[PDB]
Amino acid sequence: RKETYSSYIYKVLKQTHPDTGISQKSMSILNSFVNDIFERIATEASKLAAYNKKSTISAREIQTAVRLILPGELAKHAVSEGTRAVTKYSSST
Amino acid sequence: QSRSAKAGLTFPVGRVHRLLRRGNYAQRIGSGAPVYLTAVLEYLAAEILELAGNAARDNKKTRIIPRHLQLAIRNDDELNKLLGNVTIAQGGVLPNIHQNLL
Amino acid sequence: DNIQGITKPAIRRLARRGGVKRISGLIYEEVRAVLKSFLESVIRDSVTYTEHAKRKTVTSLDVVYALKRQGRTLYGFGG
Amino acid sequence: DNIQGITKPAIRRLARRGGVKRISGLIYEEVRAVLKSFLESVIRDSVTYTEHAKRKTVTSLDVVYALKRQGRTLYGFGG
Amino acid sequence: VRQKRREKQRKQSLKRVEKLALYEIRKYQRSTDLLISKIPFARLVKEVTDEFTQDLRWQSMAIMALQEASEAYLVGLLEHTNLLALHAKRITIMKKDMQLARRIRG
DNA sequence: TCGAGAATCCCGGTGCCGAGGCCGCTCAATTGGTCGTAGACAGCTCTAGCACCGCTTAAACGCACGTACGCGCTGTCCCCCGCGTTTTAACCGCCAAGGGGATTACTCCCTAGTCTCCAGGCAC
DNA sequence: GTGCCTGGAGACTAGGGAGTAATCCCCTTGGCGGTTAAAACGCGGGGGACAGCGCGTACGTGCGTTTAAGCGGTGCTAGAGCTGTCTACGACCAATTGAGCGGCCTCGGCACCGGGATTCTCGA
C-alpha cells in the first residue's frame, strides 16, 4: 500500500488516447519518472526559497524553477499550463 | 470538496502538498503552489503519454513497452536536454549506424 | 574465475548492439576491467546503503539510490 | 559589433597555455561559436535568477548559484 | 508434474518451430532485452561484493537492475568510442580508442 | 474416360495468460477558528557602474619565406572471422532449510521550548 | 592592540523516536538431472591496419602599421540595504468522508488444432 500515481496515469491516458494499453513495468517507469521530476522540482523550489528570504513557497518560486530547469519551448508550454490551472483554481476556490 | 475538484485536477494536489509539508524540504507552502505542481506534472505526463501513444501507433502495437518510451525520450532534443542522462529499464538503445561504416 | 564469465561472443553481441563492423582481440580484457571498475564503484555505495540500514539484503531501492547518487539513474525500480 | 571581442592571438596564446601548438584557421571561429553556445544558458539562468530577485543588477551570488546548478562550481566568490 | 509436461511441450515446440557482418549491427540495435548471461554475472557480482563485505544477501531484481545499468554503461562507452575510432580512420576499433573516452569523461 | 479415395490450402474453433473491472475498506483529504510570524512598502543614503578622455602603448592586421605534414596512393602483412566441430554449463524444474524483512511499541532518552549568563568576532 | 554587541552554553519540563521480545514468512541460497544453445579450439584467408612516398600549402616566424585599448580621475547616474508598520498567512488538532490498494473475477487476440474445397492416384 504505497501512494502511487498509477490510477491517475491511466485516467489522464484515457482522456486523449484511450486506444493504447499500458503494461506494469512501463507504468512503474512512468511513476518513477514523475516522482523523480517531482523531487527535482521540490528540491529546486526549496533551494530557490532558501536563497533570497522567502520561506513560503508561492507560485513565483516554482515558476522560476520551471523556467530554470526546462528548455524554452517546454518552459513556455509549462508556464502556460500552470497559469491556466492557477486561474482555474483561484477562480473556482 | 477536494482541492483537485476545485480546478479539474487529477494528480493528487492535497497529497503533493502533504509531501511538501512533511517531506523535509521547506517550512511553508502557499495555496497557489501545489495546484501549479499538479499542473506542470500533468503537462509532462500528457506530453509523455501522447509521445507513447504515437510510438504505439506507428509500431502497430496497442500497448506501451519500454522500447517505445525509450524511443520517445531519446528522439527529442528537449527530452535529451531534460533527461539525457537517465536510462529506461529494458528500453534498448538508439538504432543509428554511423555514416562512415556505411 | 568469474571475471571471464562474460565471454568473447557476449562482448561481440554487445559491440553489434553498439554498431561495430570489425573488432580487435585487445578489447575484451579492457572491457572486463572497466566493467569490474564500474561494478566496484557502484557496489561500494550500494552496500554502504545496506550496511547502514541494519540489513543484509542488498535491496533494489538501495541500488537505484546508489545509481541516482552517481548520476546514471534508472527508472522502474523505485524513486 | 561585439561578436569579435576576442582576437586570434588570444586564442593562440590560450592554445600555447594548454598545449595545442599547431592551430587551424577554423578553430578560432569555432571557439567563438562554442563560447556563444556556452555562455548563453548560464547567462539566461542568471536572468531568471535576477527575475527571481525582481531587480535590474545581476548580483554575484546568483551567478555562483547558476554555475552551481549548471555543474561548473567556482570557488572564491561566495560562502 | 504437469508443469514439467508443459515445459517439455514448450521445448518440443521451440525445437520444432523456433529451431559481410553488416546484418548484426541493424539486428542488435532494435533489440530491447538484456544480452549478458545471467548467473555468471550473478556469480561475478557475488565475487565483487565479497571484497567489500559477512553473508550479504541479494534480491534478484537488484542484480537485474545492476545488469541493466552495466549493459547501458558499456554500450554508452562503446557508442562513444566508435566515433573516436572512425575519427582516427579506423573501422576496426582498438584499445587506444577506449582510452581517451575513458580519460576525458572521468 | 468416369469415379472413389488420399493429401493439402484455406477457413473456422478453441485453449490461455495478460489487460480490465470490481467489492471491501481504512488510515489519509477537507474544513475550521485561531495565532504567532513572514513579509511587502517606504524614507534615505550610499555606493558601484558609465562616459569622456589625459596620456600613453603594446598588439593585432596582413603580407612574405619555407618547410612539416594532411590527404591520397601504393605496397605490405597478419589477425580476427566465417565456418566447422567439440564441449560445457545455463535454464528450467524441483526438493529443502532457514534466515533476515516486515510489523507491533515502551521505557528511556534525547530534543523543542524556556529563560539566564557569558565568551566569541569582525570592526576601530 | 582594543573593543562592545550577541550568538553560544546550558539546566528543567513535556513529548516524540529507539531497539529489544515476538512471530510470521517469503525469498533465498544450495544442490540433482537434462538438454541445449552457447562457449571454445582450430584453420584458411582476405580485407583492413600500417609504413612510406608526392606534394603543396598554410601556418611557424618576422616585420610595418594602426587600433582600439589600458591605467588613472571624477562627476553622473541610478541601483542595493534597514529600520518602522501594517497586513495577511500558512499551520494544529478533530469529526466526517474517500479513493486507491488487497485480492478476486471477466474478456480477447495469438498460437495451436480440425473441417470444406481443391488437387493428386488409383481404381472401377
From Swiss-Prot, chain A:
The modification N6-succinyllysine is found at K11. GO terms for biological process: chromatin organization; regulation of DNA-templated transcription. The keyword Nucleus applies. There is a cross-link at K88 (Glycyl lysine isopeptide (Lys-Gly) (interchain with G-Cter in ubiquitin)). Monoubiquitinated by the RAD6/UBC2-BRE1 complex to form H2BK123ub1. H2BK123ub1 gives a specific tag for epigenetic transcriptional activation and is also prerequisite for H3K4me and H3K79me formation. H2BK123ub1 also modulates the formation of double-strand breaks during meiosis and is a prerequisite for DNA-damage checkpoint activation. Deubiquitination is performed by UBP8 in presence of SGF11. Phosphorylated by STE20 to form H2BS10ph during progression through meiotic prophase. May be correlated with chromosome condensation. H2BS10ph is also formed after H(2)O(2) treatment, and is a step leading to apoptosis. Core component of nucleosome. Nucleosomes wrap and compact DNA into chromatin, limiting DNA accessibility to the cellular machineries which require DNA as a template. Histones thereby play a central role in transcription regulation, DNA repair, DNA replication and chromosomal stability. DNA accessibility is regulated via a complex set of post-translational modifications of histones, also called histone code, and nucleosome remodeling. Present with 443000 molecules/cell in log phase SD medium. Belongs to the histone H2B family. This is Histone H2B.2. The gene is HTB2.
From Swiss-Prot, chain B:
Keywords: Acetylation, Chromosome, DNA damage, DNA repair, DNA-binding, Isopeptide bond, Methylation, Nucleosome core, Nucleus, Phosphoprotein, Ubl conjugation. The keyword Endoplasmic reticulum does not apply. The modification N6-succinyllysine is found at K6. Its main location: nucleus. It is found in: Nucleus; Chromosome. Induction: Transcribed during late G1 and S-phase, repressed in G2. Phosphorylated to form H2AS128ph (gamma-H2A) in response to DNA double-strand breaks (DSBs) generated by exogenous genotoxic agents and by stalled replication forks. Phosphorylation is dependent on the DNA damage checkpoint kinases MEC1/ATR and TEL1/ATM, spreads on either side of a detected DSB site and may mark the surrounding chromatin for recruitment of proteins required for DNA damage signaling and repair. N-acetylated by NAT4. One of its GO terms (biological process) is chromatin organization. One of its GO terms (cellular component) is nucleus. One of its GO terms (molecular function) is protein heterodimerization activity. The modification N5-methylglutamine is found at Q90. The nucleosome is a histone octamer containing two molecules each of H2A, H2B, H3 and H4 assembled in one H3-H4 heterotetramer and two H2A-H2B heterodimers. The octamer wraps approximately 147 bp of DNA. In contrast to vertebrates and insects, its C-terminus is not monoubiquitinated. The [ST]-Q motif constitutes a recognition sequence for kinases from the PI3/PI4-kinase family. Belongs to the histone H2A family. This is Histone H2A.1. It comes from Saccharomyces cerevisiae (strain ATCC 204508 / S288c). The gene is HTA1. The chain holds residues 17 to 118 of 132 of the full protein.
Curated annotation (Swiss-Prot), chains C, D:
It is found in: Nucleus; Chromosome. The chain holds residues 25 to 103 of 103 of the full protein. This is Histone H4. Core component of nucleosome. Nucleosomes wrap and compact DNA into chromatin, limiting DNA accessibility to the cellular machineries which require DNA as a template. Histones thereby play a central role in transcription regulation, DNA repair, DNA replication and chromosomal stability. DNA accessibility is regulated via a complex set of post-translational modifications of histones, also called histone code, and nucleosome remodeling. It comes from Saccharomyces cerevisiae (strain ATCC 204508 / S288c) (Baker's yeast). GO terms for molecular function: DNA binding; identical protein binding; protein heterodimerization activity; structural constituent of chromatin. The modification N6-glutaryllysine is found at K68. The keyword Acetylation applies. One of its GO terms (biological process) is regulation of DNA-templated transcription.
UniProtKB/Swiss-Prot annotation, chain E:
It comes from the Eukaryota. Changing L74Q: In CSE4-111; impairs nuclear division by disrupting the core centromere structure. Ubiquitinated. Is degraded through ubiquitin-mediated proteolysis when not protected by its association to the kinetochore. A motif (Nuclear localization signal) lies at residues 4-19. Residues 20-106 are annotated as: H3-like. Changing M98T: In CSE4-102; impairs nuclear division by disrupting the core centromere structure. Mutation in CSE4 causes chromosome non-disjunction and cell cycle arrest at mitosis. Histone H3-like nucleosomal protein that is specifically found in centromeric nucleosomes. Replaces conventional H3 in the nucleosome core of centromeric chromatin that serves as an assembly site for the inner kinetochore. Required for recruitment and assembly of kinetochore proteins, mitotic progression and chromosome segregation. May serve as an epigenetic mark that propagates centromere identity through replication and cell division. Required for functional chromatin architecture at the yeast 2-micron circle partitioning locus and promotes equal plasmid segregation. Belongs to the histone H3 family. This is Histone H3-like centromeric protein CSE4. It comes from Saccharomyces cerevisiae (strain ATCC 204508 / S288c) (Baker's yeast).
